[PDB]
Design an enzyme around this catalytic site. Structure first.
Site, short mmCIF file in Angstrom:
data_model
loop_
_atom_site.label_atom_id
_atom_site.label_comp_id
_atom_site.label_asym_id
_atom_site.label_seq_id
_atom_site.Cartn_x
_atom_site.Cartn_y
_atom_site.Cartn_z
N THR A 10 97.93 4.03 66.32
CA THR A 10 97.01 4.65 65.37
C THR A 10 96.75 3.71 64.19
O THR A 10 97.38 2.66 64.06
CB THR A 10 97.62 5.99 64.88
OG1 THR A 10 96.56 6.68 64.24
CG2 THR A 10 98.77 5.85 63.91
N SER A 79 97.55 9.69 68.04
CA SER A 79 96.86 10.06 66.80
C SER A 79 95.39 9.61 66.74
O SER A 79 94.63 10.08 67.58
CB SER A 79 97.75 9.50 65.69
OG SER A 79 97.40 9.87 64.37
N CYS A 80 94.90 8.71 65.88
CA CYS A 80 93.50 8.27 65.92
C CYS A 80 93.11 7.37 67.08
O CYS A 80 91.94 7.07 67.26
CB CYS A 80 93.15 7.54 64.64
SG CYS A 80 93.48 8.58 63.21
N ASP A 206 104.30 19.35 65.37
CA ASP A 206 103.60 18.30 64.65
C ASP A 206 103.21 18.78 63.26
O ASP A 206 102.52 19.79 63.11
CB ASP A 206 102.36 17.92 65.47
CG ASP A 206 101.66 16.63 65.05
OD1 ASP A 206 101.61 16.28 63.88
OD2 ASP A 206 101.12 15.95 65.91
N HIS A 234 105.37 14.39 65.05
CA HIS A 234 104.13 13.70 65.40
C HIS A 234 104.36 12.42 66.21
O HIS A 234 103.58 12.08 67.09
CB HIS A 234 103.37 13.35 64.13
CG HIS A 234 101.94 12.80 64.34
ND1 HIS A 234 100.89 13.35 64.95
CD2 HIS A 234 101.51 11.61 63.83
CE1 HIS A 234 99.86 12.57 64.82
NE2 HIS A 234 100.24 11.53 64.14
N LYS A 235 105.46 11.72 65.96
CA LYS A 235 105.74 10.52 66.72
C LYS A 235 106.63 10.79 67.92
O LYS A 235 107.79 10.40 67.97
CB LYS A 235 106.38 9.50 65.78
CG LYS A 235 105.45 9.05 64.66
CD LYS A 235 104.15 8.44 65.18
CE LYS A 235 103.44 7.72 64.02
NZ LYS A 235 102.16 7.16 64.40
#
Length: 256
Positions: A10, A79-80, A206, A234-235
């Site tokens: 990300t 993520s992104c 998350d 999240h990770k």
């Protein structure tokens, strides 16, 4: 079966975010490429030299250009990173066996490229100690950011060990979402990105890509498969590495 996974980080991160998952996939016999995208990780460029998410995605496009005819990869973006998958699939869909969204944005073909990111900003509007800056590139004013350390600790690396959070403090760089430019970008196509098999992996634990945002994405554009990992943060490639490697093996066995 064995596959060639291409792992995509990300913004503000680098290939180093995959340092636990990459050895694990290779131990199962898979080929693994973990790329630093432009102005990321140990890539020499600075974010002020980059004017768009498409320019940012250059190492991935260059990599996909270089694969020999008939060779296919599985893209895995976190993520992104789902936006880098959309850009690459529009140009090299013949080269992609499938794409795996790992707590990731899932762009569609119906709305503008910034749509899903605009929604994330509605759902998660306070980025705590993240600092912003502006720069100009090709006549456009771009807002860059540097992820704050309290946001890193509380929302992104919530359950990671202190030595994993230490790497994030040492290695995260200035990046950009290029939101105003994504908005004016042409839509992702139905024949390129739209034709790719999509596997959505996520956790309701998350703390930035909140369940409301993630369940909204699944309803906005239905993935080919959804896997929900219990626990983690999240990770997931750091806190649930083995679970993620099990999911990717199953994806290698279905898609090619």
């Amino acid at each position: 079966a064995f596959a060639h996974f291409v792992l995509i980080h990300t913004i503000c991160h680098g290939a180093w975010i995959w340092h636990k998952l990459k050895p694990l996939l290779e131990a199962l016999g898979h080929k693994v490429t973990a790329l630093d995208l432009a102005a990321s990780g140990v890539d020499p460029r600075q974010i002020e030299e980059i004017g768009s998410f498409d320019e940012y995605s250059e190492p991935l496009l260059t990599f996909l250009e270089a694969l020999p005819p008939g060779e296919k990869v599985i893209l895995v973006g976190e993520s992104c990173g789902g936006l880098n998958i959309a850009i690459a699939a529009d140009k090299y869909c013949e080269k992609i066996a499938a794409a795996v969204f790992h707590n990731s944005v899932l762009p569609d073909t119906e709305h503008c490229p910034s749509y899903v990111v605009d929604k994330l900003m509605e759902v998660f509007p306070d980025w705590k100690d993240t600092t912003y800056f502006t720069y100009t590139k090709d006549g456009k004013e771009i807002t860059g950011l540097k992820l704050g350390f309290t946001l890193l600790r509380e929302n992104l690396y919530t359950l990671c060990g202190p030595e994993e959070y230490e790497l994030a403090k040492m290695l995260t760089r200035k990046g950009s979402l290029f939101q105003n430019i994504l908005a004016k970008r042409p839509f992702f196509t139905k024949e390129g990105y739209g034709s790719i098999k999509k596997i959505y992996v996520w956790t309701d634990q998350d703390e930035i890509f909140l369940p409301e945002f993630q369940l909204w994405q699944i309803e906005n554009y239905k993935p080919d498969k959804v896997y929900k990992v219990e626990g983690g943060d999240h990770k997931l490639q750091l806190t649930k590495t083995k679970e993620i490697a099990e999911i990717l093996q199953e994806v290698a066995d279905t898609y090619n």
